[PDB]
Design a protein around this motif. Structure first.
Motif, PDB file in Angstrom:
ATOM      1  N   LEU A 119     -51.637  27.228  46.567  1.00  0.00           N
ATOM      2  CA  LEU A 119     -50.524  28.099  46.498  1.00  0.00           C
ATOM      3  C   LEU A 119     -49.615  27.944  45.184  1.00  0.00           C
ATOM      4  CD1 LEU A 119     -49.565  28.663  50.070  1.00  0.00           C
ATOM      5  CD2 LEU A 119     -50.238  30.458  48.760  1.00  0.00           C
ATOM      6  N   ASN A 120     -49.786  26.955  44.383  1.00  0.00           N
ATOM      7  CA  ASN A 120     -48.894  26.578  43.048  1.00  0.00           C
ATOM      8  C   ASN A 120     -47.503  26.306  43.379  1.00  0.00           C
ATOM      9  OD1 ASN A 120     -50.965  26.663  41.221  1.00  0.00           O
ATOM     10  ND2 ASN A 120     -50.878  28.945  41.476  1.00  0.00           N
ATOM     11  N   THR A 121     -47.134  25.545  44.529  1.00  0.00           N
ATOM     12  CA  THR A 121     -45.752  25.625  45.053  1.00  0.00           C
ATOM     13  C   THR A 121     -44.917  24.490  44.284  1.00  0.00           C
ATOM     14  OG1 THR A 121     -46.083  23.766  46.601  1.00  0.00           O
ATOM     15  CG2 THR A 121     -46.664  25.943  47.563  1.00  0.00           C
ATOM     16  N   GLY A 122     -45.620  23.626  43.562  1.00  0.00           N
ATOM     17  CA  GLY A 122     -44.985  22.540  42.895  1.00  0.00           C
ATOM     18  C   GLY A 122     -44.471  21.441  43.561  1.00  0.00           C
ATOM     19  N   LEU A 123     -45.191  21.183  44.879  1.00  0.00           N
ATOM     20  CA  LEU A 123     -44.689  20.099  45.755  1.00  0.00           C
ATOM     21  C   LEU A 123     -45.604  18.920  45.562  1.00  0.00           C
ATOM     22  CD1 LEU A 123     -43.712  21.949  49.030  1.00  0.00           C
ATOM     23  CD2 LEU A 123     -41.992  21.297  47.355  1.00  0.00           C
ATOM     24  N   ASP A 124     -45.051  17.557  45.156  1.00  0.00           N
ATOM     25  CA  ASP A 124     -45.949  16.550  45.373  1.00  0.00           C
ATOM     26  C   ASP A 124     -46.042  15.981  47.061  1.00  0.00           C
ATOM     27  OD1 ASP A 124     -43.334  15.061  46.072  1.00  0.00           O
ATOM     28  OD2 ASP A 124     -43.376  13.755  44.335  1.00  0.00           O
ATOM     29  N   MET A 125     -47.018  14.797  47.019  1.00  0.00           N
ATOM     30  CA  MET A 125     -47.280  14.666  48.417  1.00  0.00           C
ATOM     31  C   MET A 125     -46.014  14.024  49.300  1.00  0.00           C
ATOM     32  SD  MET A 125     -49.400  13.968  50.944  1.00  0.00           S
ATOM     33  CE  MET A 125     -51.235  13.716  50.494  1.00  0.00           C
ATOM     34  N   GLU A 126     -45.215  13.360  48.542  1.00  0.00           N
ATOM     35  CA  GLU A 126     -43.878  12.563  49.377  1.00  0.00           C
ATOM     36  C   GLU A 126     -42.605  13.904  49.708  1.00  0.00           C
ATOM     37  OE1 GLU A 126     -44.246   8.880  46.456  1.00  0.00           O
ATOM     38  OE2 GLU A 126     -42.564   8.795  47.612  1.00  0.00           O
ATOM     39  N   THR A 127     -42.642  14.854  48.912  1.00  0.00           N
ATOM     40  CA  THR A 127     -41.619  15.981  48.901  1.00  0.00           C
ATOM     41  C   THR A 127     -42.170  16.758  50.059  1.00  0.00           C
ATOM     42  OG1 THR A 127     -41.022  15.928  46.675  1.00  0.00           O
ATOM     43  CG2 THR A 127     -40.363  17.964  47.885  1.00  0.00           C
ATOM     44  N   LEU A 128     -43.659  17.089  50.141  1.00  0.00           N
ATOM     45  CA  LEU A 128     -44.296  17.619  50.893  1.00  0.00           C
ATOM     46  C   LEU A 128     -44.232  16.991  52.539  1.00  0.00           C
ATOM     47  CD1 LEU A 128     -46.128  19.997  51.966  1.00  0.00           C
ATOM     48  CD2 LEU A 128     -47.907  18.603  51.164  1.00  0.00           C
ATOM     49  N   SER A 129     -44.447  15.703  52.448  1.00  0.00           N
ATOM     50  CA  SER A 129     -44.236  14.841  53.731  1.00  0.00           C
ATOM     51  C   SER A 129     -42.773  14.992  54.279  1.00  0.00           C
ATOM     52  CB  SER A 129     -44.298  13.475  53.518  1.00  0.00           C
ATOM     53  OG  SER A 129     -44.310  12.628  54.616  1.00  0.00           O
ATOM     54  N   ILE A 130     -41.634  15.072  53.409  1.00  0.00           N
ATOM     55  CA  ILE A 130     -40.408  15.362  53.772  1.00  0.00           C
ATOM     56  C   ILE A 130     -40.167  16.857  54.539  1.00  0.00           C
ATOM     57  CG2 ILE A 130     -37.811  15.727  53.095  1.00  0.00           C
ATOM     58  CD1 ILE A 130     -38.421  13.449  51.212  1.00  0.00           C
ATOM     59  N   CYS A 131     -40.765  17.852  53.667  1.00  0.00           N
ATOM     60  CA  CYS A 131     -40.697  19.094  54.407  1.00  0.00           C
ATOM     61  C   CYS A 131     -41.471  19.424  55.754  1.00  0.00           C
ATOM     62  CB  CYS A 131     -41.413  20.067  53.259  1.00  0.00           C
ATOM     63  SG  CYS A 131     -40.330  20.235  51.595  1.00  0.00           S
ATOM     64  N   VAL A 132     -42.701  18.712  55.844  1.00  0.00           N
ATOM     65  CA  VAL A 132     -43.325  18.675  57.211  1.00  0.00           C
ATOM     66  C   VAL A 132     -42.582  18.085  58.264  1.00  0.00           C
ATOM     67  CG1 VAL A 132     -45.409  17.555  58.078  1.00  0.00           C
ATOM     68  CG2 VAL A 132     -45.728  18.849  55.964  1.00  0.00           C
ATOM     69  N   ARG A 133     -41.948  16.959  57.781  1.00  0.00           N
ATOM     70  CA  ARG A 133     -41.052  16.296  58.983  1.00  0.00           C
ATOM     71  C   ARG A 133     -39.565  17.137  59.276  1.00  0.00           C
ATOM     72  NH1 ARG A 133     -41.343   9.815  57.975  1.00  0.00           N
ATOM     73  NH2 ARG A 133     -43.350   9.839  56.777  1.00  0.00           N
ATOM     74  N   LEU A 134     -39.329  17.792  58.440  1.00  0.00           N
ATOM     75  CA  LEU A 134     -38.131  18.624  58.571  1.00  0.00           C
ATOM     76  C   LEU A 134     -38.443  19.942  59.577  1.00  0.00           C
ATOM     77  CD1 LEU A 134     -36.287  18.603  55.007  1.00  0.00           C
ATOM     78  CD2 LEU A 134     -35.466  18.186  57.155  1.00  0.00           C
TER      79      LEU A 134
ATOM     80  N   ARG B 185     -34.933  13.625  45.551  1.00  0.00           N
ATOM     81  CA  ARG B 185     -36.244  13.836  44.913  1.00  0.00           C
ATOM     82  C   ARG B 185     -36.344  14.981  44.036  1.00  0.00           C
ATOM     83  NH1 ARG B 185     -40.109  10.372  47.609  1.00  0.00           N
ATOM     84  NH2 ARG B 185     -41.507  10.923  45.924  1.00  0.00           N
ATOM     85  N   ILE B 186     -35.785  15.964  44.273  1.00  0.00           N
ATOM     86  CA  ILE B 186     -35.973  17.039  43.473  1.00  0.00           C
ATOM     87  C   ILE B 186     -35.139  17.036  42.203  1.00  0.00           C
ATOM     88  CG2 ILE B 186     -35.772  19.797  43.569  1.00  0.00           C
ATOM     89  CD1 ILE B 186     -36.481  19.751  46.244  1.00  0.00           C
ATOM     90  N   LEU B 187     -33.815  16.329  42.350  1.00  0.00           N
ATOM     91  CA  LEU B 187     -32.775  16.417  41.390  1.00  0.00           C
ATOM     92  C   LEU B 187     -33.146  15.114  40.473  1.00  0.00           C
ATOM     93  CD1 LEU B 187     -29.687  17.558  43.350  1.00  0.00           C
ATOM     94  CD2 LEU B 187     -30.726  18.692  41.583  1.00  0.00           C
ATOM     95  N   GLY B 188     -33.946  14.121  40.800  1.00  0.00           N
ATOM     96  CA  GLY B 188     -34.118  12.999  40.345  1.00  0.00           C
ATOM     97  C   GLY B 188     -32.899  12.198  40.220  1.00  0.00           C
ATOM     98  N   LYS B 189     -32.281  12.211  41.195  1.00  0.00           N
ATOM     99  CA  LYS B 189     -30.841  11.557  41.271  1.00  0.00           C
ATOM    100  C   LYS B 189     -30.350  10.712  42.402  1.00  0.00           C
ATOM    101  CE  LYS B 189     -29.096  13.079  37.454  1.00  0.00           C
ATOM    102  NZ  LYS B 189     -28.456  12.510  36.376  1.00  0.00           N
TER     103      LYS B 189
END
Lengths: 93, 52, 85, 56
Positions: free
Chosen positions: B18-33, A11-15
């Motif tokens: 907080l301007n973290t630059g996270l979207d909902m799906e990346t945030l969902s991965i972070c929460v699960r981790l 996701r972060i790399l778009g790869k």
């Protein structure tokens, strides 16, 4: 954990999964070497650091809104590791 | 299910403030981790490296 | 030939043990299992090196990564991964 | 060299393969035998060998 970390790299790399193999191995190594937090696991201490950051930025209104959102997050009771999520969001601000 | 969506929506609002630059799906991965016990310091270092 | 190699593989499992009957039973089992089954490795290796590190076997994890990089610089590696533990 | 490196990986992964059994496996893969299928065969051959050793 590992599949979630691979998805994070993609996701972060778009790869695709094949193209992130080096960054995935890097991520696995960093997580594996740092199993324990070096900081105290206190949700209140993070919430205070977040509020201090809004004050430092002259964003006192956003600090008040954060305090309401934090109260709502506490009342939902869904998350077990709320401290760790707030600390991650503060670490990425 | 409802309470989990409403919890993710509150976390997304905090993430935006907080301007973290996270979207909902990346945030969902972070929460699960983090809920799986992944160290948030190590995870933040990985995310900062992956963004560079 | 494949039929010889499976014969030799069945004999290696008989080390340290009628002999002809056991060899035919093991051959039949090997073919029956192969037929039932017929009807990326690098990511599996990274997961294995991570598993070694969490068990405190960090030197063995570093050595596994070095040996695999030496081999890169596939079906056999996939077999070794599927037989891990 | 390449066989010795594969044997070192085999030991680090605790696969229970020796040099003889590994050399047979390499030649089965070189003949197009699927690794996942061959791993299943080796697992069953071990289990059956140990059951038969316990019965003799």
């Amino acid at each position: 954990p590992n599949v979630l970390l691979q998805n994070l790299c993609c996701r972060i790399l778009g790869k695709g999964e094949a193209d992130v193999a080096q960054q995935f191995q890097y991520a696995v190594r960093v997580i594996g070497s740092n199993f324990a937090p070096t900081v105290e696991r206190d949700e209140f201490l993070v919430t205070e650091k977040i509020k201090k950051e809004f004050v430092r930025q002259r964003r006192e209104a956003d600090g008040a809104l954060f305090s309401e959102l934090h109260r709502k997050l506490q009342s939902q009771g869904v998350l077990k590791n709320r401290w760790s999520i707030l600390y991650l969001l503060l670490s990425l601000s | 299910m409802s309470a989990v969506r409403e919890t993710m929506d509150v976390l997304l609002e905090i993430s935006r403030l907080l301007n973290t630059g996270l979207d909902m799906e990346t945030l969902s991965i972070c929460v699960r981790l983090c809920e799986q016990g992944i160290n948030p310091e190590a995870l933040s270092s990985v995310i900062k490296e992956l963004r560079r | 030939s494949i039929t010889k190699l499976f014969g030799d593989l069945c004999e290696s499992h008989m080390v340290g043990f009628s002999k002809n009957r056991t060899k035919q039973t093991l051959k039949k089992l090997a073919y029956d299992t192969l037929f039932v089954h017929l009807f990326p490795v690098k990511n599996k290796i990274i997961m294995l090196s991570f598993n070694l590190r969490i068990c405190g076997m960090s030197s063995e994890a570093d050595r596994l990564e070095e040996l695999v990089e030496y081999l890169e610089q596939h079906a056999v590696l996939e077999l070794l991964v599927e037989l891990s533990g």
